[PDB]
Amino acid sequence: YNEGLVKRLHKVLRPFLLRRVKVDVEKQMPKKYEHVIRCRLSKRQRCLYDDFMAQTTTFMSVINILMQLRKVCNHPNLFDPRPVTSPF
Amino acid sequence: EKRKKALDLHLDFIVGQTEKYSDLLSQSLNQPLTQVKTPIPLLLRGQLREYQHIGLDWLVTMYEKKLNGILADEMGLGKTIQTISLLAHLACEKGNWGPHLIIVPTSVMLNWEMELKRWCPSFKILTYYGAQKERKLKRQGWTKPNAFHVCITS
Amino acid sequence: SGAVKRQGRCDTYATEFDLEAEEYVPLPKGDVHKKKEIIQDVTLHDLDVANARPQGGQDILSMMG
Amino acid sequence: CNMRTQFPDLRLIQYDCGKLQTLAVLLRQLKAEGHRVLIFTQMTRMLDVLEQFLTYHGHLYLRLDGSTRVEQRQALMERFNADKRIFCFILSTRSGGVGVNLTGADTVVFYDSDWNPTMDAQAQDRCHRIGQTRDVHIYRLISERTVEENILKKANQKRMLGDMAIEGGNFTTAYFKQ
Amino acid sequence: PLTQEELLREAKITEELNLRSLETYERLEADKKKQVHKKRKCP
């Protein structure tokens, strides 16, 4: 970290940029808080994620694998809903 | 080796010019009569907040210095109202009644038109919404001076 | 199989009342008509039973039998 | 009917995804304390799964996936601000524009994080704007040992870079006056 | 080529027209909003 470079950037942007944050301007504002919650994968999600990670290295690009993994992390039903079973 | 020195000296030159501009703006903004130089325009017909009035003064200062700037006020602080006050001030005092263009999102087009009508009914507002035939019909005879003051388009 | 199952009143109507005695369901998000291919695991005895004590006609005679 | 066809239990929806479990716990606790929660996700299919899960849990909700008409967006906003029964309002972050005034709510839960932290900030500001009289809480759900940790890492890196670049400088009239 | 006095004279007319238009819009919007919040039935 070279604080001089950052100060140089600030000075460069100084004559043109005007910034106002709600915290310093509007005091009469309720506070905000941010929470980060970790979750574990289910057996179905774990199997699908591991399968995709294995298929990653062998035709699908890193973007395709990335999107599939995001869908898996969202919900495994986004690939195939659990079947409704009925007699033959 | 020479690439680093050339880049450093070029950046130093740019920084020097920017510092000169910043010093000129600081000198212009520090002129005495809280001590806001730009008064409220009589055509504003509204009450601005203290920070809004400071923003208006900054906008007029940037205009007089003939410099472009970014207004990065966070969401909801009233950038639209500050801009409307700037236009009213310039038009009344500076005589800058000329046709101004305000480019906004289509969703915000109605809201901006409403704000313009609420704060400064004096301004001739032109709205560019509609199909090609309607747009051409509204454009008909727009080259005449003093035909429209503010144009809104997406 | 001609099997009709009512799953619920549509979720869009859950705000009309405060006590309706209904189980709401969201609107289906696929197509109205779907074709799904599945693999069924059966045995010969299952076929024999199905054809010896039939219950697939959904007629009165099947229930009577 | 039960002997003729068998449907998967709606409980299995939550059992197959850890996120849905934690979201159920958090939502029930939030309703117990008496709050209103806005859930933001990037995928509309996820919004469908959330509709199923919320209806199975019985939570009254509204949905705006950007496909509703503008006047219907305004109507839904006014209804949410007026009707207290609607516990949640599932939304798509990229949608809604800037005309939405959901100050009735007081909690926002991001089902997944956007790569652009400005989008998440805009979603938060959809509820945290002026004219809101309650503390606003943000909950972010992340899956361990998955891509979501990388998404959070990049989002935080972008937030830190933005803090250094714009928040580092005073960029205000106070600096010129001082 | 117009002067400040001409601009003020025109501004009076445009202000009257804009205020009338704004009043019409506000009335229509308030009525529409009230009608959306309305819900009625038959006896």
Ligand SMILES: Nc1ncnc2c1ncn2[C@@H]1O[C@H](COP(=O)(O)OP(=O)(O)OP(O)(O)=S)[C@@H](O)[C@H]1O
């Ligand atoms: N002092 C004031 N007097 C009257 N109206 C005000 C005042 N301050 C703010 N407002 C209102 O605030 C409304 C919303 O603020 P905006 O100007 O839209 O916020 P913004 O900075 O433009 O960012 P957004 O994206 O549009 S929320 C305006 O339409 C004004 O009517």
